[PDB]
Structure formats: structure tokens, C-alpha cells
């Protein structure tokens, strides 16, 4: 008279299938990308242009000597 099945206490667990979490898609991407990339080239032309100014100063000390 000592046998298994309980009178109660059950679930069940699902048979389902779901993890579609979105996700920042669909014109949200391709907009943060271009907005990041244009910040890069804007951070250029303030350094590459400025290094071009110090470049001429480096040639300047050459030319003021050599006679």
C-alpha cells in the first residue's frame, strides 16, 4: 500500500518556444551608426588640419637656419 502517485501538486512545464526580444531594429539601427561615424570625421579636420599647422612650424626652424 506504499505506492507512488501524489494526490496533487503539479505544474506542468510548457512545451512553448519564445524569446523574440526586439531589440532596437528598423531605422533605429543605420541611424546610430551614421550618427557615430559622422562624429568621427568631425573629430577629424580639427586634428589633421591642426597637425598641418605645426608641420609648417617644423619646416620653419629648418629654413630660418641654413645660410
Amino acid at each position: 500500500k506504499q505506492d507512488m502517485p501524489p494526490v496533487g501538486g503539479y505544474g506542468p512545464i510548457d512545451y512553448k518556444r519564445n524569446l523574440p526580444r526586439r531589440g532596437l531594429s528598423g531605422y533605429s539601427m543605420f541611424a546610430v551608426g551614421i550618427g557615430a561615424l559622422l562624429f568621427g570625421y568631425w573629430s577629424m579636420m580639427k586634428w589633421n588640419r591642426e597637425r598641418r599647422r605645426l608641420q609648417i612650424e617644423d619646416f620653419e626652424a629648418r629654413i630660418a637656419l641654413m645660410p
Binding site: G40, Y41, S43, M44, M45, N48, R49, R51, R52, Q55
Partner: protein, 317 residues
């Protein structure tokens, strides 16, 4: 004391390829929910000094049907260019100040495939005869995916030296203005240096890796050794090019501290890719170079030609 500097660079890096083989599996182990080398270390840390001596005791046979002067010449050229490439590389001061050394990397990365063409031929038959011929074929095609987008940042750097490659990045961390090129920079070195998703060189279920398949643990001990010396060298080359650190002349000590921490992080990715993704089935490997990788690389090439002109932002040299 120049000669004491060279030996101060070859010897402390053979530990870092021997203490990567141990971190090859501890990192790959906790992804599987299991501990590292548990019993011999105590923590593992003494594993590779025991795992090195066994190879040089175990009998180094040569195959009877093999050639002679080719089979024992490719491991000479294996460790030669795997260690010669570490020379012109600033941290913060390089050992050698080459005028143009970025090109010298491709002058060193080109000849490595000329040993695989030897060893696949030099020993024996079909599991490395044809099975290594189609390993030279993948490594040649990923230079034109490589050499173009290596040039595509030099239009913005200014010249060919590497001291300017740290000067131009004092305020930028240059992965941002070129992040499409930075993607295909990664996958190239992921497939050229013969690693886990694009594999057929080493060999999973391909040529049952028929490029080693024959070396007993005498000459085999370098092949693995030498090879692991490339993978921490494209990582030390990516992090001096895109993700450049800051140099201070009064404090060179704080350069390297903030530097070796970064090349280690990218080196983790070559381990962290292998525990996710399956192979590529040799067609689809090369089907995505021409058809898919290559026409974008010309597209950004024409983009990076005109954009320094139509910004009036010419880099000075």
C-alpha cells in the same frame, strides 16, 4: 648592450605562448562549466613546464617515404618569421626605427604560406598532399582583403611609419571613423592565421588537419609553438593601429601597463569565438571573399580617397 636586448625579447615571449596554452583551456573550460587544470599546478600554473619536456623525450621519427632537405627546412623558416616579425613594433619604443615598416609586416606575413606549401609536399601523400594545396589557396586570397583595408587607414594616418600611428590617435581611438573597415580587419586575420571558424589548415574533420598530421613531437613542438606566436602578434598589431593608447615621454612606464592589458583582451576573442561557431565548408569560405567581402572594400577605398580631399583635411607629411 644591444645584444642583451634581443635576448630580453625572445625569451620572455616564449613563456607567453606557453602560458597561453594553459589559458587556452581554462577560459574554454568555464564555458563548458568545468574547472581548469586542477591537480598538477596547484592552480594549473606549473602545467606547461611539465608538458614541454615530454615532447623532447618522445621519439622524433622521420617518415620512410619522405624527402630529406625540405622536411627539416620548413620548421627553420617557421620560427624564423614568427619571431622576426616582433622586431619593428613600438611599445612605446620599438627595437628598430624603420622608415616604412607597416609594409614590412606584409613583407613578413607573405612568406609564411611558403612553408605550408613545403611541408604538405615534403613528407607524404593525400592527407597532406592535396589537403595542404587547398590551405595555401585560402591564405593567398585574404591578402587582397587585407592589403587594401590596411591601406585604407593610411590615407588618414599620413605616412608609413608607426610613430605617426600613435600621434594621430591622441584624441580619437580610431575605431570610430572607420568601423566598417574594422570589422573586415578582424575576420581576415581570423582566417589568414588559420583559426577556428574558417578552418581546414589545422583541421577539424577536414584534411583531418593534414598539415601537421605527420610531425612527431620533436619537430611538431615548434609548429604549434611558432603558430601560437602569430596569433598574439596580429593582436599586438591591431591594438597599435585602431585602438591606440596614449604615449607620454616623461612617463613611459604607464604606456606598457595600459597597453598589454589591451592586446590580451583581443586575444581572448580568438578563444571566445571557437566555443560558439561551427565551420564554413571550404566553398562558402571562399564564396564570401570575392562575392561578399571584396566589393565593399573597394567601395570604402574610393570613399577614403575623396574624403580627405573634400574636407580639406589632408594629413601632414
Amino acid at each position: 648592450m644591444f645584444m642583451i636586448n634581443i635576448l630580453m625579447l625572445i625569451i620572455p615571449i616564449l613563456l607567453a605562448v606557453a602560458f597561453l596554452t594553459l589559458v587556452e583551456r581554462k577560459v574554454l573550460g568555464y564555458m563548458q562549466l568545468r574547472k581548469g587544470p586542477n591537480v598538477v599546478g596547484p592552480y594549473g600554473l606549473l602545467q606547461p613546464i611539465a608538458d614541454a619536456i615530454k615532447l623532447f623525450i618522445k621519439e622524433p621519427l622521420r617518415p620512410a617515404t619522405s624527402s630529406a632537405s625540405m622536411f627539416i627546412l620548413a620548421p627553420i623558416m617557421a620560427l624564423g618569421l614568427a619571431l622576426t616579425m616582433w622586431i619593428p613594433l613600438p611599445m612605446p619604443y620599438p627595437l628598430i626605427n624603420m622608415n616604412l615598416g607597416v609594409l614590412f609586416m606584409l613583407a613578413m606575413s607573405s612568406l609564411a604560406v611558403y612553408s605550408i606549401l613545403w611541408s604538405g609536399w615534403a613528407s607524404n601523400s593525400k592527407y597532406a598532399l592535396i589537403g595542404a594545396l587547398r590551405a595555401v589557396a585560402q591564405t593567398i586570397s585574404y591578402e587582397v582583403t587585407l592589403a587594401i583595408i590596411l591601406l585604407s587607414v593610411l590615407l588618414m594616418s599620413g605616412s608609413f611609419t608607426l610613430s605617426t600611428l600613435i600621434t594621430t590617435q591622441e584624441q580619437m581611438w580610431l575605431i570610430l571613423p572607420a568601423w566598417p573597415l574594422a570589422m573586415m580587419w578582424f575576420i581576415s586575420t581570423l582566417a589568414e592565421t588559420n583559426r577556428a571558424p574558417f578552418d581546414l589548415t589545422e583541421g577539424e574533420s577536414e584534411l583531418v588537419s593534414g598539415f601537421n598530421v605527420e610531425y612527431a613531437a620533436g619537430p611538431f613542438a615548434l609548429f604549434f609553438m611558432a603558430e601560437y606566436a602569430n596569433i598574439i602578434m596580429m593582436n599586438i598589431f591591431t591594438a597599435i593601429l585602431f585602438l591606440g593608447t596614449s604615449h607620454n615621454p616623461h612617463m613611459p612606464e604607464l604606456y606598457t601597463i595600459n597597453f598589454t592589458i589591451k592586446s590580451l583582451l583581443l586575444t581572448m576573442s580568438f578563444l571566445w569565438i571557437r566555443a560558439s561557431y561551427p565551420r564554413f565548408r571550404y566553398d562558402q569560405l571562399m564564396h564570401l571573399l570575392w562575392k561578399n567581402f571584396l566589393p565593399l572594400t573597394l567601395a570604402l577605398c574610393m570613399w577614403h580617397v575623396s574624403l580627405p580631399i573634400l574636407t580639406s583635411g589632408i594629413p601632414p607629411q
